[model samples]
Target chain A: DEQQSQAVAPVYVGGFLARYDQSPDEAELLLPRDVVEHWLHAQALPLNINHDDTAVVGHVAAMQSVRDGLFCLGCVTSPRFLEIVRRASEKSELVSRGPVSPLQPDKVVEFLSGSYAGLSLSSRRTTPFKHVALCSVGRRRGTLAVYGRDPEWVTQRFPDLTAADRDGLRAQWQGDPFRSDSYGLLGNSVDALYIRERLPKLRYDKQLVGVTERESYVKA
Target chain B: DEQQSQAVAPVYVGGFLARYDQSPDEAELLLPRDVVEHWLHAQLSVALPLNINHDDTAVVGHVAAMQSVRDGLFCLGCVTSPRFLEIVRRASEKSELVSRGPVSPLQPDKVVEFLSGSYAGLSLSTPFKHVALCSVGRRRGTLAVYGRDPEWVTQRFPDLTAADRDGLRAQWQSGDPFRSDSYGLLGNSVDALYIRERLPKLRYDKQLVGVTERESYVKA
Candidate 1:
């Protein structure tokens, strides 16, 4: 069977680094309160992280990966996306140790469609790598993907990147950034915010609900 | 000046949040070791960012703001984006106080083609209350734009958001996400690994070089 066709598949991911020259207090004035809140959330989320009670302070940053070939969107983090990865890693491990709950046919469907973050670890494992931020955006057909890349890094190291590695990142985002393969537990695009707001609305109509191993399938 | 004169301007930008689930130990297994070093140097050379203290031990996250509208891009520490905003704000104020330099410019040609952080405070002073994340996929035209009260957000928060806020976020990701009037800094869909690698190249090209003001004039 084709690797991607399998129910369990390997996905590739890429990362970028954003360095800031100033401190947080100064930065806050320039952004909206909500954006600041989101950034805080990304920074403060614990990662099996540790620090002395006195010195502990939260940090914020942004990062994302792309589904190489398909142009599907993948994990989108507000602040330090690495925190989300840490949380997901923790969650994935917990799920692997034992089923969090019996994979109910209906619940699995619901989980895939809405509560994706609650479902990611059960599907498959993913490996991530650092790729150069390129000037060009990734898209399929004609859509334009708004992204930033470290041009120098990309130009120098792009050739060194393994073909599989590049393709993996593209494929991961090709379907849905949050839930396509990773259990769709986190959600994607419009679904990310909508489900968070109207989760109760999801349980209403029977058609509104779906039972599928694939989150995208639920939408279909 | 006619902003829409450029038929090729981007209408939206696809913002993404990508994360990898792994521990620091496990995370290292995901990517090549030298990637970070490359990113650090690139950003430093261009003054896009200061040097990173590798001694700072913690799993990291990253984000990038790619101007789909104009090929301009900017990046900073994950926790640093807001900080970057702060720096720009201060720089703007300092420049005003001292008559040192001009404010950052967002003109398509003058933006990315200019220098690092040149457009930092350009949007800070704007009355626009909302900043959005947008995407214009090559084939899809516009995949999604989140921010302010994008159509989806407004649908849910009709009473909370003003009409302009709602309308701005809902606007499509044209071929250009950087059409000055319609453009706003997007915070999501940043790829970390990509940024780490590319920061160097940006610095090399002076794309990430210089202070916000010194590079601010080219746009005018």
Candidate 2:
């Protein structure tokens, strides 16, 4: 088996799992503090294949919280995955993918989805979040990527939270980090990530993308 | 009235208005940050009456965060509101809102015998604890924003980030009325409801003490 074929070294990885708004090429954004905090509750998470629930490829051994994002560290036990990722990461070596040469690639990082507790509305749009997915695609730019591998422009731009905010979370985190409640943050089941559910459509008018405009200081 | 950027009356108005006397531009009418902050302290202090319902039940909440803005003072922390008090009661019954676990700056409602920074130990035997409104504020930020009328919520604070928003998601999702990082309350509409349990809730023992302009109270 691939698991036994080679000695699996722990993968030391990091990158923004997601960010603020939907990106030009996608349609998603991570949710507010509760969802983000819950996302952090998981000591580890399954690293599956391109959002495939059944094709769970590896495990994120550890996770780090960042402002509006998540950073992960772990390894891919799948030998084939390692090869594919390596080749793709090489960019020009085999892919012909010219990032046009600024060391940045044309590929976009993104995420999949799980379920949700409730939807939160903002001036731009209404967003519901309870869980996250590592694949398919994300609407938020600078989301998914290999840390150290991508340039600053490719990574989500935010600072890591300091100790005062960090340690308090783990201290209050549920005893079993992988418990059902841990499946997702903000009341969504953490274990429900495998369930692959979505809220039924009610078609509320939820498009909040006009970043160039502002009613912030508009008249009385 | 704002058609020609007319001189806004009262310098400031319905919103956190204060200055820009003759400038025809309504946008500049915002109060100076320092001045607004100076006046906002007592207005928003957890030690006095606040913006929520006058007779709503109360609770003693810890200060999670505080900020001084052009409009006035605002915070995204927990505790100190009648609406927040209701959630405090709800959180207590639902999950680990009142845990006997590690000390959290967020949950001061822990039901147990503990020493206050200023005093010794006090015992708590019930799941729910009674508190007096030693503080006050409005409930519109938390409940109103997350309420069905999300548009209203967004119009209040559009720049709210996903990590910023999730604070209350899990608490509500878990069915607890209590939440940590939540609601952008402007000015001070909510007040703190300190827990004495057996002792009576008192606004101020006027005959026994006097509070100076700086808020330090010294006994006669």
Candidate 3:
């Protein structure tokens, strides 16, 4: 019953990206054998479709192949997403000391580039890029926060990232009205506030901190 | 290389009515405190009036009280929806032993009386009978089916039944559609053909069998 029992509402990790590997033998990635079998049996029946009919057999086979292909894409992308997040954290020192620069639209682009430059990957070619607004509370006169709409671009620019790491990064950042309470949005913790606080120092006049509440508020 | 295998597809279950207790207290239900708290917070945030000049102390207390009330309601509705197949299994024996009877709707008054007499522990009252539907299929569109669609069934009876149950009597003699596939629809385990085979016998005069494959139909 104590009033202070609310431990800063737990953070949530959001955003999900899954890509498919496009190749003839990539059926393993598109659809797992087990899933294909399950769906096939579910649709099988005496009158529904004969198990031996060529048309029905081909239909089921194609469905399984397509599903497996999509699954394979997800399989490949998940690891890549995670790898990108890790490299970005390491290079930017975001893991230990938090962010070196404020979370500005441009700074985000730079971070995305620096994290995956070896692969010649950049945001413009892969995913759409736009400003991201990060505001957790209501607007107070001049105070507003925003982020970007382009996560795919930010992810492709970082080549060293495995699909999983890239997914982790997209889960952490990207999107409008970025929420600190979201898990992994700020590197698996609410410490996103710490990063937000440091941004003003790194970018100097380029980034501005509008509010000093327990939560960070970005200007749109 | 194998042809026979189960296929996987996402199946979503929506509505079912399961048993629930009548108590309106937190201790009556078995949900975790944190889960309850999180649900309450989300609900309160969405529902609470956010008018300015809200006294902070008063608002907190009001929110807490509202949460407690909501939790109590959840406790009252303890169980999730019931699976229809399970219920049919339980009622089958009675149907098998009894002789076939003419299709007739249960008098709402009689249903209300039964609820009050038999299931008062479930907090059911006579004037407030829940809707129930019962129907039976036979070779000639036989077997008695009973259920209540108030606007449709109300004129036939004064009282309304919320719970509906049907038992088939006379397997070969009654010529009921329900006899053939009771298990299939209730259990939701097998193909529609299971139910289809029985439908011909049920509506012997209708000539409806073989018009559609059994798997093409649904149990309920």
Candidate 4:
């Protein structure tokens, strides 16, 4: 890594990426808010190429759990990466690759694909951060996942998931240095404001919905 | 370590941060584990050579299984260094260590198959119930295996030589380097007899795994 000379860049995993859904007929879902909140404080994670553990290219500077997926920013420290990254940037959607907290296969009824229901987010077990990756396509689309941005209206259409649920999964968004509100607002920073304003609509379908999109690598 | 000092200075380890300061200021060093998530994330790891970076060692022990916890990242891994076991000893008062008496090779049933198959009545008045407990080692926790010596081995087999079994002797005599990842005796050949013979030299039952000591260091 040429980290010593690299300039940091924003690496946001914006907008409810994907959540548990047991809805047989294209039901959208939401991951328990508090569940994802626990993901914070994990200071930094690696940024690899398409979830490949053998090819780590950068480090995620910070991760914040928002109403959406995690809001992260970091430097792609590998000089060997720019051209490759730019290729993805040219495509503009470096959808995250993995990191699935366990869920009850039976209890998963709501659809981030539409609503939030009740269920304990107790995973098979808590795991370490794998890596955020850049890829040709993400399981979810229209997210800040791409380099540009999505309009605010598209993001607003989704259901709200800030309050505590029957299973106690809520916005445990109060950590040291980061906070959020009703939507996925983690701060008042221009980045947050812009992210909030231009959030995109996640595209979920049977093909994407049936899959768990869990990070594929082992613990690092 | 062979690794540059600066690369690991504050020496971040399994969710704990060990640091040093030279200031007159006192009263602060912190380590925090999330009760459980941190542990769960340690994807079962493979053992790495002692103190060598995964980069330096060809072993697949680094990367993955490393996620961030509040403020820092940590990992759960297997190391060949029993010196670490000593550290664990001093920190613990209760016993979590699991110990076994003499480890034979994993596959080949018992020495009964050998001495009997070879018909060692020429074995004279060989009073042998079990092969020498030639293997004592630890994999995880306070666990370890015990071993015996080859004193009786020479009387049984004149073919074995000093060089053929010397390394095992060296390892057993000196408790510092409890080398050999597999704890020998895994093969279907005669080397098992070699390791089995030299193993008892290890005064394992008497080995204190010494860790009691007082520390006096300048804290700034």
Candidate 5:
């Protein structure tokens, strides 16, 4: 019997993970449960193995992993998590298809002001207005990708948005440092990113297909 | 001939009103409405009495009277003004009705001690240690003292200024029966009368209350 062949190695999957210092695309790969337990033990945490249940141990390990720049995929049972994954995958696919250009600073401002004229984009008590961007390719996809320094603030505005959206934006926009640099500064102090899809419009009138019209018409 | 005799004359009543500078009880007597309105017109540069309606004019006069005494009375409703007038009359009558004595220094301390000893009678969670003397009568008739730990009360109202403390002491010891003293400080400081009425075990429990029992009881 082939004993070495029969031994199953831990399978790995590529997806979004929560992080602090770096982008979500740079999020570390989640390790197996055994490896997580090993790390937990290596850290010399006082875990009551006899008294405490497996769920508690798992939660601690996962929390530790999140702190260590790796997201726990095992906890994706919620519909919100599933949606995030779907959005992230779609964003990643879009990024992989071809190289997309970044919007100019003026164009970003123009787009934001035009899209949300009545809404206040200024920093509020709960939500901080940090880094913001408009993806040229994302516009074509009927979605606008926005990035901020704090994920919580972005989530405060878009409660339904998940970690997957963060991962997708990171993968799609933050693919190259040079590409982001070319886009220039959208805002000075920002933390989180939010993707808002264009609202459904009543197009009863005759359609005009031109660069100028398309740019302004998307706002309608 | 009856019409001349039936002419209505202005009525005046004395009572405490809410004042910013001093206690609410120290507020001056409410002035006549026409006199208050005349003052308001004189103060205004434009004297827009014609433009103002009857209710608004009445409110302006009432507000002016309140401001003169630094009174905290917010708004004057038609029904409430009559009630306030009745209260003023009652308060004035009560002031004239009561006659009492002065407060002595030794009496203040003795009152504090008497209140502190009667723990069950007082129904206090914490033992009274500090004495804040408040003068109830004009002459040395009855010495009334309020008791409480100064540290505890001070901690609760950290914003209370040194001037406020001095004011509290002055108001307490001042032998003026008609002088309006604040009721706000009463809750924070325990009164001798309250202790005498509540503390039934004061005379019987002569044992020196130690720190341990005091602390345990206080915490409980």
Candidate 6:
């Protein structure tokens, strides 16, 4: 019964954003290799993720989710994003629906050279909004990976986020800079290197591997 | 002077040997990817070395030391030997000379027993050991050896006479194994997955961040 309940558990998607001084130009919009490398390192081990291609797919899904305006507007592309896309497109199911194209070096340069004009439409905001990269992985419809910079920004665009949802977001942001639930996502299983360096203060319950009381932001 | 002495401090090299009923064939001698992956997971996050590649090199060296000995021998491969050698090699600016290798497969039970014996040997007589055993039972699981000075270990565990050591050894040989000491190692750490799964009795410290009396092992 407990297992059944956990299996059909209702999952929540949320994360926080820290303020940055200035938005990155288009060149910075591409994902960096270091960040992707860190994600690969975290997801591969401990879990022994067998399908290397699927791991890359999950990574691109996370990145694209952020780029399509899921999280923050100023999210710079991680350099590793294109590499991951190439690798995933070669062997993964990511390109099954349609053909995927890698970002051209010239396009990156062009975007960097000309950007602030179109930015006003999306960037226009009365209040100063914080922007920080946050990724969430949950099993809603066969592994839902959400990436965003600010929960408040997401809430503004989609007014469905209730006061309780906003409160839950605050709770998630309280302790660990990155948070996850028992629903099982790549975000929940972070790289050990990132955890050690960025989130050193975070401690887990010995009895529960990834589930700490303060850290577990489970809804159901 | 303190930093200098600490840097040049005498480090002890010691480890336990797991006895197999029969020596593994050639294929088994090559360390499995799972073991290497676990070790990598343990090492990368906690201790941040400037060059990550060197950490892999250090792991290979540690595994090679363990595997070079025949299956049944008492392989007391101390972390100090390879780790110190690695530092010396790096400091001398001849990093390329170090030959790092992989681990071979040994009996899982034997490895667990050996690791338990090593942990018990270092942790016995300390409040840490007592608390860990009391909560977790005989199997305290594997731990990383930091900067536990050999002299201090000898002084702290002075009452561990030859008979006591033999008794502890016998307990390890026999199945009811449990022990610990302040004198740990600075070798590449290990994954406790096998130990936790196989020896379900092992209890971690309250927070589960590390083993009991974890702070006793200094960074010197």
Query: How many backbone clashes does every candidate have?
Result: 95, 45, 111, 34, 24, 35
Model 5 chain B poorest ten-residue lDDT run: B122-131
Instruction: List the lowest-lDDT window of 10 residues for candidate 2 chain A.
Output: A211-220
Give TM-scores for every candidate, taking all chains together and pairing residue i with residue i: 0.17, 0.24, 0.15, 0.23, 0.14, 0.26
Question: What's the distance in Å from true for residue B98, model 3?
Answer: 38
lDDT of each: 0.22, 0.25, 0.21, 0.24, 0.21, 0.23
For residues B1-220, write the lDDT of model 5, one tens digit per residue.
Answer: 4422221111211111111222223234333334433543453232121000111211111111111222221111011133222222222222211111113322222212221221112110011111112212111111111123332222222223465445333421311111111111111111222112121222112121221222211110
lDDT of 6 by residue, A117-174 (tens): 0111111122221122222111011121111233343333323334654454444333
lDDT of 5 at B185: 17
Provide the lowest-lDDT 10-residue window in model 3 chain B.
Answer: B165-174
User: For residues B1-220, what per-residue lDDT tens digits would candidate 1 score against the true structure?
Assistant: 4522331121111221111211223232231224322433342122111111111111111222211111111111222232222222332222211222234552332112111222111110011112222111111111122112123322321122354333334332201112111001111111111122222322222222222113323221
**For candidate 6, what is the TM-score?**
0.26
Q: What is the DockQ score, from 0 to 1, of model 3?
A: 0.01
Candidate 3 structure, TM-score to reference: 0.15
Q: What does candidate 3's lDDT look like per residue over B1-220, in tens digits?
A: 1211110111111011111222223334333445444654552132221100111111110100121221121111111112322222223212211112212442322212211111111111021122111111211211111122212211221121222111001100111112222212211111111122333333331122221222111111
Candidate 2 lDDT, tens digit per residue, B65-150? 33343223333222333344332232222222122322333223221111010111111112112111212111111111111122
Error of 6 at B57 (Å): 5.9
Candidate 4's residue-wise lDDT over A74-134, tens digit each? Answer: 3344544332232222211111221236522210011111111001111222353555654
* Selected candidate, larger lDDT, 3 vs 4: 4
Off by over 4 Å in 4: A1-31, A41-43, A85-127, A140-144, A148-220, B1-220
* Residue-level lDDT tens digits of model 4 in B98-215: 1111123322211111211111111000111111111221111111111112232211222224643343233223233332221011111111121221222122211221111211
Reference contact recovery of candidate 2: 0.00
DockQ, all candidates in order: 0.01, 0.01, 0.01, 0.01, 0.01, 0.03
Model 3 lDDT, residue A118, Cα: 12
lDDT of 5 by residue, A1-220 (tens): 3422211111111111222323222223222334544543453111111111211111111222322232221111222222222222222212122222342222222222222211111111211221112212112111222221223322222223347644543342221111111001111000001112222210111021111222221222
Candidate 2 lDDT at B128 equals 12
Docking class of 4: incorrect
- Candidate 5 has a TM-score of 0.14
DockQ, 0 to 1 scale, candidate 2: 0.01
TM-scores of chain B, in order:
0.19, 0.23, 0.18, 0.17, 0.15, 0.26
